[PDB]
Amino acid sequence: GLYRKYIEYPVLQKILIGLILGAIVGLILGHYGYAHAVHTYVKPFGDLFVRLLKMLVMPIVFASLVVGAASISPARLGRVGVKIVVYYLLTSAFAVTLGIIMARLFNPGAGIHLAVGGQQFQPHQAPPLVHILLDIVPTNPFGALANGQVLPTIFFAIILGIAITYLMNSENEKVRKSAETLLDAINGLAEAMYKIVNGVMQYAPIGVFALIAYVMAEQGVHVVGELAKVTAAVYVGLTLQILLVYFVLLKIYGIDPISFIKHAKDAMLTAFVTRSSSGTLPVTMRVAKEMGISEGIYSFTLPLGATINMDGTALYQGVCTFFIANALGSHLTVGQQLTIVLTAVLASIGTAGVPGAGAIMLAMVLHSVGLPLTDPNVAAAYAMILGIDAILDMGRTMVNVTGDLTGTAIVAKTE
Amino acid sequence: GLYRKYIEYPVLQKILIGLILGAIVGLILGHYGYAHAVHTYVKPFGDLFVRLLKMLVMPIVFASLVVGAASISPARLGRVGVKIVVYYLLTSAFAVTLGIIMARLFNPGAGIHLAVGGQQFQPHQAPPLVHILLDIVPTNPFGALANGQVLPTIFFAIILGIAITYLMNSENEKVRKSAETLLDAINGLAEAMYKIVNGVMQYAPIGVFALIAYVMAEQGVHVVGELAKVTAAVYVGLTLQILLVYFVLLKIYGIDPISFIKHAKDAMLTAFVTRSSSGTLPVTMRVAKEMGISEGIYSFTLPLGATINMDGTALYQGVCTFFIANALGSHLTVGQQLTIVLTAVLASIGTAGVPGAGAIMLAMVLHSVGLPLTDPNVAAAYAMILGIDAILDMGRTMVNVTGDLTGTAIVAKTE
Amino acid sequence: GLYRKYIEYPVLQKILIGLILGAIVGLILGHYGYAHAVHTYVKPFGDLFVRLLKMLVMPIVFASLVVGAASISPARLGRVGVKIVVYYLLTSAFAVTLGIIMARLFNPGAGIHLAVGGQQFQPHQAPPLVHILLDIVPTNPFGALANGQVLPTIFFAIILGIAITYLMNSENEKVRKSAETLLDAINGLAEAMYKIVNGVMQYAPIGVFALIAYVMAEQGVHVVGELAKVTAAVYVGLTLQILLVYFVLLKIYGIDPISFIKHAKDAMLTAFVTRSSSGTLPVTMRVAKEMGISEGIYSFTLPLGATINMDGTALYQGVCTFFIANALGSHLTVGQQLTIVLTAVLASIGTAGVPGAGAIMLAMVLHSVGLPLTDPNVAAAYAMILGIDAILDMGRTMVNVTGDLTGTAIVAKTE
């Protein structure tokens, strides 16, 4: 009876209920020193939810890209790829520019209270751009599906789908039956993955409550004081990023942004809580399929953009760079923010397949200015920033996924 | 001609012939110092047989669980799971209790002849129960199928099968054809695996002869003397475990135990020789399919129980703990055997996915009593036990697999 | 327009054009000290081509061996296997014999100008033959497909194909539909892989130009002088190997060698440039499919022979061993070249699954003579050889692949 009442209750209402009571119970138990208790008792439910959403990432990206490449190969896919790459670079530049502006409006960093403490161990720089651009072609397709590797799986699935499309028009009548068997089996795998992510989103409110309860419990207390200016600057920059870039881009290309948010509420909240833009790829592809977009556009612009397009990470990089520059008391050489913008774009395009990309992206952005992370002062101020990393990480993951959904909708409306 | 005479000869007769001549030639060549010669020459045939049976473990557990979850999902699978978990915990408790009784009837351990020798390097304890209970959900399904991981493969196959069952009743007529293609391909993979394990069991007598020849050659000589009481206590406890637990449980639920043994002779002997309960999973699933049990019961209670239900290991843990307690000359505090029973059950339930589980299970069972494995005396007595590990390991693997077959038959007769 | 002119231009003409201008521009830029510039700028296109051809290696070897084992299992596959193993051992013996003769005709090694320099770190010897012969059966099929392992994939695909062939003749009518679904899906995967390798060979001239430009740029300058005798001896031995073994073997079994070369031009040139005999397996299987050979012969003798049959490596082993023997000024004990021939055959058969097999093959061939690689003089002379390793590696990979194509054609003409 009560289980039937819980299932038949709508999903977005209980997601909001879990979010609100998670924030309340998290701040209350963080205010009273019960951090280790909630960390050992409640956080495993959120870890289970994150692992349940990371389970479906690789089969859905393989299967509904093999069946997603049943579109016209020289006309559609090339134009969609070049348009979505141009879009991703443009919005990353706009996002880091707006982050620089939002950090220049506030004054984050006044007091000098830095002890040396624990410093960063010279964070290892990115591999050369040739090696990362050669990472896209896989040496083994099963070895690319076996551990991560979203970009080699994208490449292999695209090539297999184009080959199957060329295969099903052959003059033979056995090769046609073989290819129409393989395509139907892979399509069945994709539809099974969507039917699973329906039930995972049915489970989602418990994990949302647990995750944001732990986040607002451990790092919900350390946010008051000087770091509140950093949190306010990042969050105001992210909401102004949405309302002044994505709304303008949807009003230019003639789709209602309110109906767009009414659709993408699911993936936006799941990416806000889950704190991993690659771990909400099944929810993003589900909400793109329910938005009325053909497979050959969303199925390629979403898993590509979950690895390249990081807008909220770029805005946090700009705000963190300006906070490090104010902590040491530098003028920061007005006109050299073009180097910050350029390196924030080139770091996103040149750290595609590398795991742990955000840390070395922030490292090379700080290194291009003149504050390398081997200095003890910048390491102390960055360690002071890192205590509230999750509170900024939630919002920047939400904007990182909303960017992908907006770009997919723009390219699909254009084509 | 002679090859046709070898193939058309029945399988159980040549399995018994290979077993008997393997035991005879093993004791003879162990009595005469030809241990290294038989170890280098004859043991590779048994290693080839063990690898041939370990090849079929992961595809059959994936495929005939995806097609095995074509039963009613809320009614059948939940009741089968909770009943088989209750059964496994109950028989593990009964087995370690009977092991304590059988060690208390005998007097294993009289002489104190322990030098320090080579001692155990503080065997690393189990991971926390939250992490092992979170291991069940996989972060990657292909990464769970790629190296071991019977429990994440069980979880992913169950969820995929329930999704396909929900999928084949949809109102669409393309999704139905896609799902009925995928299910038929996976069913073809399962039937191909059973057709392979037929021929592997045809090969099996050479590997049985080689394996038990090496086992009775290297550790068939060190069994006489004081350790013969340990071997007799373990083997009498295992046969009394079978004849006084499984026979009573089959006579309660109304199936003939003699016909049950006449069926399960194949998997019992293969698990007796192969010395790996996970490596005789295809033979166990084949003999459960030939026993007339539907897929939704045997296909889930066998690979789950090949990782959790260890009855013979629990009985050997009880007997080894009592032997360590008699070797140091302790009273062993009558009434504290409840802690031995409780930790032998909780160690089985809390060391599910860990590889090398039996060593750290025995370690924590010895640690809960008051004889931790860092002491030199208990390390010397355990190193004296370890010389006859294979002779006990054969019988305890046989009882470990017969427990799974009995529990599957009980749940299938009930449902 | 120009892209249409590039695509519609024939493939072998632009492959020869890229080869010739690659050799010319490579020698010119190597003569002028522009080695690092061409290494950083042009070599990545060849690396991209090599990775594009290594992508298709594992799915095509799995898929068109599962569908390739739809032949009569006891009659065809056993005779084909034993005939191709006999062929591979015989031509490896002939190749190392002709290498010994060709090194004895020339006089490679006159001057003694060896400093100690950088020496080999006692190159680790091969695993025991039992362990390498047990490597053929996989402990995990998905773990064998996940990283390399051509031989366990061959074994698992053969067993799965024989099981499907036994399955499709069963009296059931659901198992037949399941097996005919699985076989058609795997056949669709194989045909998709061939349709991909068509386009990869369309891309191939850019990679051919880049690869041979870098090879003739870095190690095209160090070839003149004393090492030119080594290069001439190796290349004359390889062309005499082809024209006096493979032409005689095709004229004995009654097929025209000129039409055979007119077919196998594609795989011969791709193996000549790519410098990896396992990385031109899709081109070899494509040219064997276009040569009119049934699947059950080429599909098994090509991926097996890409791991065992190394004829050009055997000839280079003989010539390098004789060069090391002339560098130290030894008589080399006429009549002990039987040990060189025997160890060059047994090293090929006993280092099958090991990665990095050629180095330890040359190591054990040098060790069986009396010049172990721990001596400083032989390490200095081998380090002097290693400067022109690529120039010999191109031709010896070409002969290594032409051996497989010749043996497949002989067994297919016989059967």
Numbering used by the authors:
A (entry chain C), B (entry chain A), C (entry chain B): 2 to 416
The authors write:
Sodium and aspartate symporter GltPh is an archaeal homolog of human glutamate transporters, which clear the neurotransmitter glutamate from the synaptic cleft following rounds of neurotransmission. Briefly, the transporters are homotrimers with each protomer consisting of a centrally located scaffold or trimerization domain and a peripheral transport domain that harbors the L-aspartate (L-asp) and three sodium (Na+) ions binding sites. The crucial conformational transition from the outward-facing state (OFS), in which L-asp binding site is near the extracellular solution, into the inward-facing state (IFS), from which the substrate is released into the cytoplasm, involves a rigid-body ‘elevator-like’ movement of the transport domain by ca 15 Å across the lipid membrane. Here, we report a series of Cryo-EM structures of GltPh reconstituted into nanodiscs in the IFS and OFS.
TBOA and TFB-TBOA blockers share the amino acid backbone with L-asp but are decorated on β-carbon with one and two benzyl rings, respectively, that cannot fit within the confines of the substrate-binding site. They block transport by binding to the outward-facing GltPh, GltTk, or EAATs and arresting HP2 in an open conformation. In the outward-facing GltPh and EAAT1 in complex with blockers TBOA and TFB-TBOA or Na+ ions only, HP2 opens to various degrees, enabling access to the substrate-binding site. In the OFS, the bulk of the transport domain remains mostly static relative to the scaffold, and the labile HP2 serves as the extracellular gate. Interestingly, HP2 opening in the OFS, as seen in GltPhOFS-TBOA, and the IFS requires displacement of LipidOut. In the OFS, when HP2 closes over the binding site, LipidOut fills the space between the hairpin and the scaffold, and when HP2 opens, it displaces the lipid and interacts directly with the scaffold. The nanodisc is nearly flat in the GltPhOFS-TBOA structure, where the hydrophobic regions of the transport domain and the scaffold are aligned.
